[PDB]
Ligand binder design. Structure first.
Ligand SMILES: *[C@@H]1O[C@H](CO)[C@@H](O[C@@H]2O[C@H](CO)[C@@H](O[C@H]3O[C@H](CO)[C@@H](O)[C@H](O)[C@@H]3O)[C@H](O)[C@H]2NC(C)=O)[C@H](O)[C@H]1NC(C)=O
Ligand SMILES: *[C@@H]1O[C@H](CO)[C@@H](O[C@@H]2O[C@H](CO)[C@@H](O[C@H]3O[C@H](CO)[C@@H](O)[C@H](O)[C@@H]3O)[C@H](O)[C@H]2NC(C)=O)[C@H](O)[C@H]1NC(C)=O
Ligand SMILES: *[C@@H]1O[C@H](CO)[C@@H](O[C@@H]2O[C@H](CO)[C@@H](O[C@H]3O[C@H](CO)[C@@H](O)[C@H](O)[C@@H]3O)[C@H](O)[C@H]2NC(C)=O)[C@H](O)[C@H]1NC(C)=O
Ligand SMILES: *[C@@H]1O[C@H](CO)[C@@H](O[C@@H]2O[C@H](CO)[C@@H](O)[C@H](O)[C@H]2NC(C)=O)[C@H](O)[C@H]1NC(C)=O
Ligand SMILES: *[C@@H]1O[C@H](CO)[C@@H](O[C@@H]2O[C@H](CO)[C@@H](O)[C@H](O)[C@H]2NC(C)=O)[C@H](O)[C@H]1NC(C)=O
Ligand SMILES: *[C@@H]1O[C@H](CO)[C@@H](O[C@@H]2O[C@H](CO)[C@@H](O)[C@H](O)[C@H]2NC(C)=O)[C@H](O)[C@H]1NC(C)=O
Ligand SMILES: *[C@@H]1O[C@H](CO)[C@@H](O[C@@H]2O[C@H](CO)[C@@H](O)[C@H](O)[C@H]2NC(C)=O)[C@H](O)[C@H]1NC(C)=O
Ligand SMILES: *[C@@H]1O[C@H](CO)[C@@H](O)[C@H](O)[C@H]1NC(C)=O
Ligand SMILES: *[C@@H]1O[C@H](CO)[C@@H](O)[C@H](O)[C@H]1NC(C)=O
Ligand SMILES: *[C@@H]1O[C@H](CO)[C@@H](O)[C@H](O)[C@H]1NC(C)=O
Ligand SMILES: *[C@@H]1O[C@H](CO)[C@@H](O)[C@H](O)[C@H]1NC(C)=O
Ligand SMILES: *[C@@H]1O[C@H](CO)[C@@H](O)[C@H](O)[C@H]1NC(C)=O
Ligand SMILES: *[C@@H]1O[C@H](CO)[C@@H](O)[C@H](O)[C@H]1NC(C)=O
Lengths: 147, 377, 260, 49, 98, 45, 49
C-alpha cells in the first residue's frame, strides 16, 4: 500500500500524494510484475509433467534404496525424508499464512517483525503452489524416473 | 473500483489489487494527566486585604496550571476587562512567566490602568508598557470593604516629578514641589505630601465607590514555559477505532489493554519499526496497546467484463470473522453465506467446490477461481 | 556558617578504569527484545575516571562540568549530602543546589554566595544529630524552589561492612537539567575500586533551571571512609540492547575498538 | 501540521513525500534486479530438470 | 475579479494575508488557503478619522465558530459566553457581538 | 454554484427518472457569501 | 512564467525540472531492466537457432 507507507493514516497526506499520482501505480504494477513471475518460475521448474505418477506398493529397484528420497505416508505433508530435512534448514520470513488478530494483537506483536512490517503497509503474498503441491510434483518426477 | 484503478471501462479476466480496506475511527478521544496543582487565584483575588495603588503589589504565578475561566465563574459577579489579547485563547496557551499586579482604586481611574494612558494613576504610580499583553480584572468591593465611617486606609499617589517607568512602582514618600522655591522641612507654600486617601463609604456613587483591581501581565511563547492552561480530556474507550491524542502524542488506532509492563518513567512504546504502538494512560496509570485500525489489501476477482459483471473479493491476509466488523455505518459482500477462508485471506462472492480443475484465475495458496456453469435451469 | 580550614592535604588525584558503567535510558520510551542505536552523550568505556576518597583525610575540590558528568560513590552511612552546580558560585551569577539533610530534599536555583569550604559535621552521629549548615552565608534571588521527602533509600536487612553503590548522570540540555541514577547493594572489594559488571540508570528528575553551568562541587559530611569517582560524558554513537522485559541489558560503545 | 501553517507545511511534507517515494522506488528497482537474477536461476533449474 | 472592501485597525493588516489567524481572521473575514489575488492596505485617518471619534466603523468581538473563507456574517444575536440560556438583550456574560 | 440540463422525454408511466445518461452544464457561480443548511421549493397552484 | 517573477518563479520550475528528470530516470532504469530480459531471450533464441 504505497499510500499507507508514504502517508501514515492521514487523508490530508493522501490529498498531497494525489498531485504525484501515477508514480504509486507504476510501483504497484512493477511489484505485481515480480509477484506473477515467482509463480511462472515455480511452474516452469516443477510442473513439467502433465501427470502425477505413483510408485507401486512393492518398493524394489535392483537393490537401489530410494526410500530416503521417496514420499513417506506417516508425515501429514507428503515430503521425503531428505525434503523434510531441507525444510528445517531455511528460516523463512512469512510463509504466506494468515495472521488472525488473536496473534498480531497482544504478546506476539510485542516482538514479531512480520506483524510490525504489516502495519507499515508492506505485505508478503503466498505462492500459487503450496509446499505440499511442490512435494506432489517432485514425487511425480521422482516416481517417473525410478520406474 | 477496478475500472477506476485501471482507468478503463473494460476489465479483462484476472485478479486486480485495488484501494486497501481500512476501517475508520468512530470518534475522537483525548487524554491528559488529570490536572496537577492549580495556580494561586485564591491568594491573588480572594485575599483579606488588597494593596493601595501607590503600594501596588507584585506576585508570581509559576510551576502550576492556570484556570482563567473558573476564577471568573466563582460565586461573585466581578467586572473583567481587557486591553490587548484574545481572552478566550489563554486557557489554550502557555507562558514563559505569569505576573499579577494587585491594587485598589475608585471607579473613575479604572481607565488610567491601561498602557498608552496618561493622568495621575497612569503617570505617577501605575504604568504598563506601551507593548503590554494582557487584561485587567476589577470589581466594586462596596459589598465587603466599604465602611460607613470612611475606610480611608486605601491611598493613592497623585504627584511625581517624572512619569514613572513601566512596572516601576514608587514607594519613596518624598514631599513633592509645585513652586519654584525649594521645599525644606515637611511643609511649605506649594509643598505637598504626594498621596491622599479615598473617602469610601457605602453611599459613594458610581465612579467613586471602592474597586479591587488585578492586572495579569504575562510573558509568553518565546522561552521555556512556567505555567500553561487547562488541558481537556474524555473518557477512555477500548477495542474500537478512534482518533487519539495522549499528552500531545497524536495518532489514530484501536486502544487495548496490554500485559506488557513499562518501567515507571516510559510514557510511549515503539515497535521494531521505530514508531509508537503503546502508551500509558496519564490520568490513571495503565499500559495500553495501540493497533492501527484494521485493514488488508483488497483484490477483486473478475471474469472478462465482456462476459459478466459478477465479481468476487479477496481480503488479503484477513480472517473471515474480522471483515464484517467493517460494517459501513461499497459493502454488499458483507451479507455472507458464500464466504470461504483461504490461506491467502478471506474470499467472498465465489463458491468453494470439490471439482479440482486446472487453474484459470490464480488466487494463491493452491486456490484458483473460474467463471463456470455450476451444475454437477 | 562558613570557615575555610587550613588542614587541607593536597595530593595528586587518582584514576580508575570506567569498565562498562555510565549508561542511562536516553529517552522516555519503551522498547523490548531489540537492538537500538543512538547518538548521545555517554561516558566512554574504559576511560580514566578521576578517583576521590576521604578518611582524617578530606577532599571537596571544584570540578569542571563541560558537556555533562557521571558521578558514582561506594559508601556507607550517606556521607554525600548532594551537589552544587553553576558558573561562579558566588552570587555574581546563578547556581543550583541539590541536597538532602537528615529529614528532606531541597532543589533551589538561588544566587548563593558559596562558602570557601562547604561541609556538614555528624561523625556517625556519635555525639550529636543534625544542626550544622556549612554551605552558604547569603542567598539573594531564589527564583526556583522545590522540597520533598528525604531521598537515598538504604539496602534492607544489612550485611557486615557491606557498602552501597550510587550512580548519577547529570546534564544541562535546551534549558532543562536532567538527573539519571541507579542504587546497588555491592559485595565490598578490598584493594579494588569501581565494580566490574553492568546495569543502566533510570531518569530520576527533570528541572527547568536554564542557567549557565561551568563547574560543580560535592557536599560531604565531617572519621568517615567514603570514596567516589567522577567522569565526563562525550558525544558518541552507542548501541543499546533491550531485553523482552524492556530493560537496557547490554551496551556497546561504538568507537571503543574495531570489533565494537 | 502541529507547528506550521498550510504553506510551510505543504513544503515540509513535500520532503517526506519525496524521500519516502525515493525509498520505495529504490526498493522496487532493487527488487526488479533481484527478480531478474532469481529468474536466471529458475531458467537454469528448469533446464537441469 | 471580485473586489473586496472594508476598514480595520492598522495593526491587524497582518491578519488579511491567507492562512492567518486572530480576531478578525477567525470571527469576520478570512481568505482561503488557496487564495489567488492581491491585498492593498492604506491608512486613511485624513478621510475616515474624526477628533470626536468615528464610532461608525466597527468589528466583531465574538462568534459561535471560526467562519469559512469568504463567508459574511451580519447576525446581531447575543453571544452567550455564560453557561445558562440567556434570553433577550443581555445577561451574565452575554455579549452584544459588534 | 449552479449546473443544469434540459431533456425532453416520452412519458413512461409507473416508474421514475428515465434510465439513461447526460451530464449537466455549468450555469452560474454567485458570490452569495452565506451559510446554507436548509432549503425549500416554490410551487404554483 | 505568465504568472511569477524570475527570483521566485524558479523555485516552482526547479521542482518540476526535478520531478520530470526523475521520471525519465525511472523510464531509462525500467528500459535497461527490460532490455536485459529481452537480451536473455535473444541469446536463448540464438542458442535454439
Ligand atoms: C533403505 O535404507 C534405510 C535407511 O538405512 C533402511 O531403513 C533403516 O533400517 C534400520 C533397520 O530396520 C532401522 O533401524 C532401527 O529400527 C527400529 C526403528 O523403529 C528401531 O527399533 C531400531 O533400534 C533401529 O534404530 C533404521 O531406523 C531405518 N531407517 C529409516 C530412515 O527408516 C531400509 O531398511 C533400507 N531398505 C532396505 C530394503 O533395506
Ligand atoms: C533540613 O530539614 C528541614 C525540615 O526538617 C528543612 O526545613 C524546611 O525548609 C523550607 C525551605 O527553607 C521551609 O519553607 C517554609 O519556611 C517558612 C515557613 O514559615 C516560609 O517563609 C516559606 O514560604 C516556607 O513555607 C520549611 O518550613 C522547612 N520545613 C519544615 C517542616 O518546617 C531544611 O530546609 C533542611 N535543610 C537542608 C539543607 O536540607
Ligand atoms: C521478566 O519479568 C518478570 C517479573 O520481573 C520475571 O518473572 C519472575 O521470574 C522468577 C524466576 O523465574 C519467578 O520466580 C518463581 O518461579 C516459579 C513460578 O513460575 C516458582 O516455582 C519459583 O519458586 C519462584 O517463586 C517469578 O514468579 C516471576 N514473576 C512473574 C510475575 O512471572 C522474569 O523472570 C523476567 N525475565 C528475566 C529474563 O529476568
Ligand atoms: C479465524 O479466527 C477464529 C477466531 O479467532 C479462529 O477460531 C478459533 O480457532 C482455535 C484453534 O482451532 C480454537 O481454539 C478457537 O476455539 C476458535 N474460536 C472461535 C471463536 O471459533 C480460526 O481458527 C481462525 N482461522 C484462521 C485460518 O485464522
Ligand atoms: C485522577 O483522579 C483520580 C481521582 O480523582 C485518581 O484515581 C484514584 O487513584 C487512587 C489511588 O490509586 C485510587 O485509590 C482511587 O480509587 C482512584 N479514584 C478514581 C476516581 O478512580 C488518580 O490518581 C488521578 N490521576 C493521577 C495521575 O493521580
Ligand atoms: C578564606 O580564605 C580566603 C583566602 O585567604 C579568603 O579570600 C580572600 O579574603 C580577603 C579577606 O576577606 C579578601 O581581601 C581577598 O580578596 C580574598 N581573596 C580571594 C582569592 O578570595 C576568604 O575571604 C576567607 N574566607 C573566610 C570565611 O575565612
Ligand atoms: C536579582 O538580584 C540582583 C542582585 O541584587 C539584582 O541586580 C540588581 O538589581 C537592582 C534592582 O533592579 C539594580 O538597581 C542593580 O543595578 C542590579 N545590580 C546588578 C549587579 O545586577 C537583580 O535585579 C535581581 N533580579 C531579579 C529578577 O530579582
Ligand atoms: C475565600 O477564602 C475563604 C477562606 O479563607 C473561603 O471561605 C471563601 O469561600 C473563599 N471565597 C471564594 C470566592 O473562593
Ligand atoms: C465481446 O463478447 C461479444 C459476445 O457477447 C462478442 O461479439 C464481441 O466480439 C466480444 N468483444 C471482444 C472485444 O472480444
Ligand atoms: C466435498 O466432499 C466431501 C466428501 O468427501 C463433503 O463432505 C463436502 O461437503 C463436499 N463439499 C462440497 C462443497 O461439495
Ligand atoms: C590513565 O591514567 C594513567 C596515569 O595515572 C596514564 O598512565 C594512562 O595513560 C591514562 N590513560 C588515559 C587513556 O587517560
Ligand atoms: C551565559 O548565558 C548568557 C545568556 O544566557 C550568555 O550571554 C553568556 O554568553 C553565557 N556565558 C557563558 C560563559 O556560558
Ligand atoms: C451554518 O449553520 C449551522 C447551524 O448553526 C452551523 O452548525 C454551521 O457551523 C454553519 N456554517 C457556516 C459556514 O456558517
Amino acid at each position: 500500500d504505497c499510500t499507507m507507507y508514504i502517508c501514515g493514516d492521514s487523508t490530508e497526506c493522501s490529498n498531497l500524494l494525489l498531485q504525484y499520482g501515477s508514480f504509486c501505480t507504476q510501483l504497484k504494477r512493477a511489484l505485481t510484475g515480480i509477484a506473477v513471475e515467482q509463480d511462472k518460475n515455480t511452474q516452469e521448474v516443477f510442473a513439467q509433467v502433465k501427470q502425477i505418477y505413483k510408485t507401486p506398493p512393492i518398493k524394489y529397484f535392483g537393490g537401489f534404496n530410494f526410500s530416503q528420497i521417496l514420499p513417506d505416508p506417516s508425515k501429514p505433508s507428503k515430503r521425503s525424508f531428505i525434503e523434510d530435512l531441507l525444510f528445517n534448514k531455511v528460516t523463512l520470513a512469512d510463509a504466506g499464512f494468515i495472521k488472525q488478530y488473536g496473534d498480531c494483537l497482544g504478546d506476539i506483536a510485542a516482538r514479531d517483525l512480520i506483524c510490525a512490517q504489516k502495519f507499515k503497509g508492506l505485505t508478503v503474498l503466498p505462492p500459487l503452489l503450496t509446499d505440499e503441491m511442490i512435494a506432489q510434483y517432485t514425487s511425480a518426477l521422482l516416481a517417473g524416473t525410478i520406474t | 473500483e477496478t475500472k477506476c484503478t485501471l482507468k478503463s471501462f473494460t476489465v479483462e479476466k484476472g485478479i486486480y489489487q485495488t484501494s486497501n480496506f481500512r476501517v475508520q475511527p468512530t470518534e475522537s478521544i483525548v487524554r491528559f494527566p488529570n490536572i496537577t496543582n492549580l495556580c494561586p487565584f485564591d491568594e491573588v483575588f480572594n485575599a483579606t486585604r488588597f494593596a493601595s495603588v501607590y503600594a501596588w503589589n507584585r506576585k508570581r504565578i509559576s510551576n502550576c496550571v492556570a484556570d482563567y475561566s473558573v476564577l471568573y465563574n466563582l460565586a461573585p459577579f466581578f467586572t473583567f476587562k481587557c486591553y490587548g489579547v484574545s481572552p478566550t485563547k489563554l486557557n489554550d496557551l502557555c507562558f514563559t512567566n505569569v505576573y499579577a499586579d494587585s491594587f485598589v482604586i475608585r471607579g473613575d481611574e479604572v481607565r488610567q490602568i491601561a498602557p498608552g494612558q496618561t493622568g495621575n494613576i497612569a503617570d505617577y504610580n501605575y504604568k504598563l508598557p506601551d507593548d503590554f499583553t494582557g487584561c485587567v480584572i476589577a470589581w466594586n468591593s462596596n459589598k465587603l470593604d466599604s465602611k460607613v465611617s470612611g475606610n480611608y486606609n486605601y491611598l493613592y499617589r497623585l504627584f511625581r516629578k517624572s512619569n514613572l517607568k513601566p512596572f516601576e512602582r514608587d514607594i519613596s514618600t518624598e514631599i513633592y514641589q509645585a513652586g519654584n522655591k525649594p521645599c525644606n522641612g515637611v511643609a511649605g507654600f506649594n509643598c505637598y505630601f504626594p498621596l491622599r486617601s479615598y473617602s469610601f463609604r457605602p453611599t459613594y456613587g458610581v465612579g467613586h465607590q471602592p474597586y479591587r483591581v488585578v492586572v495579569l501581565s504575562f510573558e509568553l511563547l518565546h522561552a521555556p514555559a512556567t505555567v500553561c492552561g487547562p488541558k481537556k480530556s474524555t473518557n477512555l474507550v477500548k477495542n474500537k477505532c478512534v482518533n487519539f491524542n495522549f499528552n500531545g502524542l497524536k495518532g489514530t488506532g484501536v486502544l487495548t489493554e496490554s500485559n506488557k509492563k513499562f518501567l515507571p518513567f516510559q510514557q510511549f512504546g515503539r515497535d521494531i519499526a521505530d514508531t509508537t504502538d503503546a502508551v500509558r494512560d496519564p490520568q490513571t496509570l495503565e499500559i495500553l496497546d495501540i493497533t492501527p485500525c484494521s485493514f488488508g489489501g483488497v483484490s477483486v476477482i473478475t471474469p472478462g467484463t465482456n462476459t459478466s459483471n459478477q465479481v468476487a473479493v479477496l481480503y488479503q491476509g484477513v480472517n473471515c470473522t474480522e471483515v464484517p466488523v467493517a460494517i459501513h455505518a461499497w459493502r454488499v459482500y458483507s451479507t455472507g453465506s458464500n464466504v470461504f477462508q483461504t490461506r491467502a485471506g478471506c474470499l467472498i462472492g465465489a463458491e468453494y467446490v470439490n471439482n479440482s480443475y486446472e487453474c484459470d484465475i490464480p488466487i494463491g495458496a493452491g486456490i484458483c477461481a473460474s467463471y463456470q456453469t455450476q451444475t454437477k435451469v | 556558617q562558613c570557615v575555610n580550614l587550613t588542614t587541607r592535604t593536597q595530593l595528586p588525584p587518582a584514576y580508575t578504569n570506567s569498565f562498562t558503567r555510565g549508561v542511562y535510558y536516553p529517552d522516555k520510551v519503551f522498547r523490548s527484545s531489540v537492538l537500538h542505536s543512538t547518538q548521545d552523550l555517554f561516558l566512554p568505556f574504559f576511560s580514566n575516571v578521576t578517583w576521590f576518597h576521604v578518611i582524617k583525610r578530606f577532599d571537596n575540590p571544584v570540578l569542571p562540568f563541560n558537556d555533562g558528568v557521571y558521578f558514582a560513590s561506594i559508601e556507607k552511612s550517606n556521607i554525600i549530602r548532594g551537589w552544587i552546580f553553576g558558573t561562579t558560585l558566588d552570587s555574581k551569577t546563578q547556581s543550583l543546589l541539590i541536597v538532602n539533610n537528615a529529614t528532606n530534599v531541597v532543589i533551589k536555583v538561588c544566587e548563593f554566595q558559596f562558602c570557601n569550604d562547604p561541609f556538614f559535621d555528624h561523625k556517625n552521629n556519635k555525639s550529636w544529630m543534625e544542626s550544622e549548615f556549612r554551605v552558604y552565608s547569603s542567598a539573594n534571588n531564589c527564583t526556583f524552589e522545590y522540597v520533598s521527602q528525604p531521598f537515598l533509600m538504604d539496602l534492607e536487612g544489612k550485611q557486615g561492612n557491606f557498602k552501597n553503590l550510587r550512580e548519577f548522570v547529570f546534564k544541562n540540555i535546551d534549558g532543562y537539567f536532567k538527573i539519571y541514577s541507579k542504587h546497588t547493594p555491592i559485595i565490598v572489594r578490598e584493594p579494588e575500586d569501581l565494580p566490574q559488571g553492568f546495569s543502566a540508570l533510570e531518569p530520576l528528575v527533570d528541572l527547568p533551571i536554564g542557567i549557565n553551568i561551568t563547574r560543580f562541587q560535592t557536599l560531604l559530611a565531617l572519621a568517615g571512609a567514603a570514596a567516589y569517582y567522577v567522569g565526563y560524558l562525550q558525544p558518541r554513537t552507542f548501541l543499546l540492547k533491550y531485553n523482552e522485559n524492556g530493560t537496557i541489558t547490554d551496551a556497546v560503545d561504538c568507537a571503543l575498538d574495531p570489533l565494537s | 501540521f502541529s507547528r506550521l501553517d498550510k504553506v510551510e507545511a505543504e513544503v515540509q511534507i513535500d520532503r517526506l513525500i519525496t524521500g519516502r517515494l525515493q525509498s520505495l522506488q529504490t526498493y522496487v528497482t532493487q527488487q526488479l534486479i533481484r527478480a531478474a537474477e532469481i529468474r536466471a536461476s529458475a531458467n537454469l533449474a528448469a533446464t537441469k530438470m
